[PDB]
Write a protein that binds this ligand. Structure first.
Ligand SMILES: [Zn+2]
Ligand SMILES: [Zn+2]
Length: 56
């Protein structure tokens, strides 16, 4: 499956797409990915579009 993360940071913006075999695994990956980017934000998920957002 494919999932997207929109990073809406104060000083960094991004869009990342991954392949994953599980929805919760994708969430866990993206949370670690944002943490590793130094991005600390609030989260959303939209199942219709397979899109996570993190907003600082
Ligand atoms: Zn699952
Ligand atoms: Zn789905």
């Amino acid at each position: 499956m494919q999932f997207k993360l929109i990073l809406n940071g104060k000083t960094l913006k991004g869009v990342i797409t991954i392949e994953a075999v599980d929805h919760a695994e994708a969430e866990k990956f993206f949370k670690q990915y944002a943490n590793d980017n130094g991005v600390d934000g609030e989260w959303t998920y939209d199942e219709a579009t397979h899109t996570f957002t993190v907003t600082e």
